[PDB]
């Protein structure tokens, strides 16, 4: 895509607006729908945001590839663990509410 | 002791103001391998500070005619202007400004979408009989800023080889021909010799010879000084323009466009006193008349401020939207440097050194000329344009908004003359193995100078001597008192004192070189002023109040005894300097009265000059 850089910038904002609306959804309609949407949005937003950090601060062909590769492993493991928590445990919404009942 | 790097081009341009840029990429546009040598990054040149605009008979406001603009310029020049150069400049002006707009210059606009033009000092319709003209095209009051940034932008499309922050020391002369220049690279401290079949000198003015001036710090007349060191003459250097409204204190320029938009000058008693000095044009008279009018008011007790030493420029009667649209630049400047809110209080202003009518003599093609036994002789390979040159389109007094036009017309003209006279890739002329070694010896002596008067102390004594002895009004006893003082300062240059012994970015050294340049320019100014026993344009002698032409042009020419060329003063001053002694030599040459085509543009004989 010749418009790839601007398409990524627009996608970053689209996911941010979506994550913003998941917060009232998580308070209003807690359940599996929101649990897995939060897992997907939390990872994609975090993955892209941590990539901007890498783009800003890491320099040199090899350090850049090492950083982005480790980020990709971190994000893939993060999304998997969140889906695990949603399927095998109480899920994101319930955990928050339990944590706050302490 | 110094490394020398030798270059070879078809042509070399010295200067990156409006005129140098137009010439430099003009030459590359025509296939020439061109070098542009400049001691500043191009957009730092004084052109960037220009405000009011650029004249052209476009007819965007009312029906105009470039010949009406021709007449105004000849009359404004007090018949010291060369009418063939004025013809070329004023006829080419519509195409020159249209070129700039097509380059992208962000001109202000009229309801019809065309270039906005404002009234400006001493410009009329119908050959002087038809009222005020509106032909000064402008980008608000930031015209020079936009012109210089547009030309620099345009220059980036061509193969010109720029040499930025390079300081030209001297021309490379051989058998009366110019084969290039020798320059100092300020960044790494190296000496560079540029060899070229043609050199174009576009080094700006030398307003900094005075204590107070609107000019930038870098306006030190470097190219005027190389010509003088080459043994060539400079022309009409005694005609220094005093702009009416330089801000009081800092000397920053407040544009004549203020009066073009409706601003008026007021003395300590609230009189629009230009109604008495110029009943017709009032605050839009020629600058030499306005500056004299303001100066007369001040020494007669009607000055403003606590010291009674300036006057006021009032704008608050105009709507604030006009002041914001037409004059936003000087609205900010007046606040920053004088604490003035232009919608409520007047600006403190006083006549201030601003522009040099004199300079390197050329013909209308841009070619530098010398004078031998009554004939002009083109200097092979040497050109000049802009404020450094004397075409002469401005004669004894320049009309506002004609300088920026001068820049692009004669910058282009230098490029056109070289292209029709020479071809690219023609042999680059050889130079002597040690050509320019004198320039290096002088720079090294200044680099290690250890006398008793630092450069700053000598620059001041020059600027105060010029300010006291060659101001708006001049007399013989004051001019001669300043000639001996200035020639004494020049002899005292032998005891100069520097401190910076480095060579990379040694502004101590460079400014010492600029002081030498300024001094050569100042001596020629004050010595040519002392000998000119008349009053013409900006040059006002109170011991010679009349204009002395070859006839008495007030009374009918019928049966008049014509004054010989040595008994009148309608003639240019030519100045030379023996650099070692400082001795100034003066000669004269006739004013060119013919146009380029008398059937297309009638020659204007001298007449009485009033506004």
């Amino acid at each position: 895509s010749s418009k790839a850089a601007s398409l990524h910038w627009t996608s970053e904002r689209a996911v941010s607006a979506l994550l913003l609306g998941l917060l009232p959804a998580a308070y209003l309609y807690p359940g599996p729908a929101v649990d897995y949407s939060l897992a997907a949005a939390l990872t994609l937003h975090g993955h892209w945001g941590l990539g901007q950090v890498i783009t800003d601060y890491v320099h040199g062909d090899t350090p850049i590839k090492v950083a982005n590769t480790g980020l990709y492993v971190l994000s893939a493991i993060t999304f998997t663990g969140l889906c695990y928590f949603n399927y095998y445990d109480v899920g994101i919404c319930k955990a928050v509410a339990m944590l706050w009942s302490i | 002791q110094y490394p020398v790097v030798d270059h070879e081009f078809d042509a070399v341009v010295v200067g990156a103001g409006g005129a140098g840029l137009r010439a430099a990429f003009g030459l590359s546009e025509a296939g020439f391998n061109t070098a542009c040598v400049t001691k500043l990054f191009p957009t730092r040149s004084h052109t960037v500070a220009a405000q009011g605009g650029i004249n052209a008979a476009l007819g965007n406001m009312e029906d105009d005619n470039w010949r009406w603009h021709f007449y105004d310029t000849v009359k404004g020049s007090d018949w010291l202007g060369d009418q063939d150069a004025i013809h070329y400049m004023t006829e080419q002006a519509p195409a020159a400004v249209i070129e700039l707009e097509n380059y992208g210059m962000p001109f202000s606009r009229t309801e019809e979408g065309k270039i906005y033009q404002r009234a400006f000092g001493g410009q009329s319709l119908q050959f002087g009989k038809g009222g005020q003209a509106h032909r000064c095209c402008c980008v608000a009051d930031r015209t020079g800023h936009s012109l210089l940034h547009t030309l620099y932008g345009r220059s980036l499309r061509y193969d010109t080889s720029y040499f930025v922050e390079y300081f030209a020391l001297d021309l490379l002369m051989e058998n009366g021909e110019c084969r290039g220049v020798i320059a100092l690279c300020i960044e790494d401290g190296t000496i560079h010799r540029f060899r070229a079949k043609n050199t174009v000198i576009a080094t700006g003015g030398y307003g900094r010879t005075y204590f107070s001036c609107t000019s930038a710090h870098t306006s030190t007349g470097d190219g005027t000084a190389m010509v003088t060191r080459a043994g060539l003459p400079c022309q009409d250097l005694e005609f220094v323009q005093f702009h009416p409204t330089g801000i009081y204190g800092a000397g920053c320029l407040i544009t004549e466009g203020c009066r073009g938009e409706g601003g008026i000058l007021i003395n300590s008693q609230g009189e629009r006193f230009m109604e008495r000095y110029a009943p017709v044009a009032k605050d839009l008279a020629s600058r030499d008349v306005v500056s004299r009018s303001m100066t007369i008011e001040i020494r007669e007790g009607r000055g403003c401020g606590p010291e009674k030493d300036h006057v006021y420029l009032q704008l608050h009667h105009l709507p604030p939207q006009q002041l914001a649209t037409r004059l936003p630049g000087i609205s900010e400047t007046a606040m920053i440097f004088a604490g003035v809110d232009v919608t409520k209080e007047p600006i403190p202003v006083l006549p201030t050194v601003h522009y040099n009518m004199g300079g390197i003599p050329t013909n209308y093609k841009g070619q530098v000329i010398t004078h031998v036994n009554g004939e002009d002789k083109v200097v092979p390979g040497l050109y000049a344009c802009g404020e450094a040159a004397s075409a002469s389109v401005h004669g004894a007094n320049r009309l506002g908004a004609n300088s920026l036009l001068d820049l692009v017309v004669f910058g282009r003209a230098c490029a056109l003359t070289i292209a029709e006279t020479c071809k690219p890739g023609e042999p680059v002329p050889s130079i002597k193995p040690n050509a320019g070694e004198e320039s290096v010896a002088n720079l090294d002596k200044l680099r290690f100078a250890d006398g008793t008067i630092r450069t700053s102390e000598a620059r001041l004594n020059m600027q105060k001597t010029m300010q006291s002895h060659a101001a708006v009004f001049r007399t013989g006893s004051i001019l001669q008192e300043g000639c001996e003082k200035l020639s004494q300062i020049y002899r005292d240059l032998a005891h100069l004192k520097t401190f910076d012994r480095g060579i990379v970015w040694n502004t101590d050294l460079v400014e010492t070189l600029e002081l030498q340049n300024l001094m050569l320019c100042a001596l020629q100014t004050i010595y040519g002023a002392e000998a000119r026993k008349e009053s013409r344009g900006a040059h006002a002698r109170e011991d010679y109040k009349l204009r002395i032409d070859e006839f008495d042009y007030s009374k009918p020419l019928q049966g008049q005894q014509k004054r010989p060329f040595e008994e009148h003063w309608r003639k240019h001053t030519l100045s030379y300097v023996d650099v070692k002694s400082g001795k100034v030599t003066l000669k004269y040459r006739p004013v060119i009265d013919r146009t380029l085509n008398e059937e297309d543009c009638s020659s204007v004989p001298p007449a009485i000059r009033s506004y």
């Binding site: 800003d56 | 957009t43 960037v48 249209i98 992208g104 019809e112 800023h145 920053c252 400047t333 520097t498």
Partner: protein
């Protein structure tokens, strides 16, 4: 009734082998000096230390020569009032995160080259009638250039941007970017899509993260940050 002000100024001499950057202090009687910092630099150079090196010319805030870091911020020394509080020393540095040629003079050639890279000149598809007639532009379309064309290329904004600090080799910076926008929205230019397409990479435009140091520091009161945001909106909506 002298008022002695203290200035502390960065010094480095490239002609002295082994020379290390230091901070030299000068004392200036404000009663015998102009109101602006540049007047103090010039008075210091004329009378106290002729080796102090810096760029200057117009002394009225229009040419851009004298940009530097004064009292912590990037400004023009000639439009910056001297702080008359004699209980505080004014610290003067070169433009930040730049190679120092000497004393207060930075190397701007990368900043100039980045400006060249965006082709800052009017471009039309048909330039065969260049120089024949003035192009038309309504007062309204010309107003859109206000706030943009006045830039004096002083480099105060770009050298105040942390993104230009870390990625100045590939991030164009707010001065150059705002000039790109000044040509994108000139109604007379025909290469708008081409100028947007130039910025389709992770660095040229998209290293800007809306820190807004650039707008705070601009001595001409311009807003390069808003210009960048207007570019980004154009990048996201133009169709090829």
């Amino acid at each position: 009734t002298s008022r002695i002000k203290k200035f502390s100024i960065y010094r480095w001499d490239p002609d002295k082998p082994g020379d290390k950057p230091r901070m030299q202090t000068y004392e200036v009687d404000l009663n015998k000096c102009g109101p602006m910092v540049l007047d103090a630099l010039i008075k210091i150079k004329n009378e106290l230390d002729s080796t102090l090196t810096f760029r200057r010319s117009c002394r009225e805030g229009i040419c851009g020569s004298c940009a530097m870091n004064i009292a912590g911020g990037n400004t023009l020394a000639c439009t910056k009032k001297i702080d008359p509080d004699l209980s505080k020393t004014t610290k003067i540095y070169p433009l930040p995160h730049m190679y120092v040629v000497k004393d207060l003079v930075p190397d701007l050639s990368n900043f100039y080259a980045q400006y060249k890279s965006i082709e800052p000149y009017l471009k039309k598809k048909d330039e065969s009638k260049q120089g024949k007639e003035q192009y038309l532009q309504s007062i309204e379309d010309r107003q859109k250039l206000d706030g943009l064309y006045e830039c004096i290329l002083c480099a105060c904004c770009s050298t105040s941007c942390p993104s230009y600090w870390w990625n100045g080799d590939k991030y164009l910076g707010p001065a150059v970017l705002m000039q790109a926008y000044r040509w994108m929205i000139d109604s007379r230019d025909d290469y708008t899509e081409e100028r947007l397409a130039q910025l389709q990479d992770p660095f040229s435009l998209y290293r800007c993260h809306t820190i807004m140091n650039c707008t705070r520091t601009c001595p001409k009161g311009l807003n390069p940050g808003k210009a960048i945001a207007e570019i980004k909106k154009m990048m996201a909506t133009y169709k090829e």
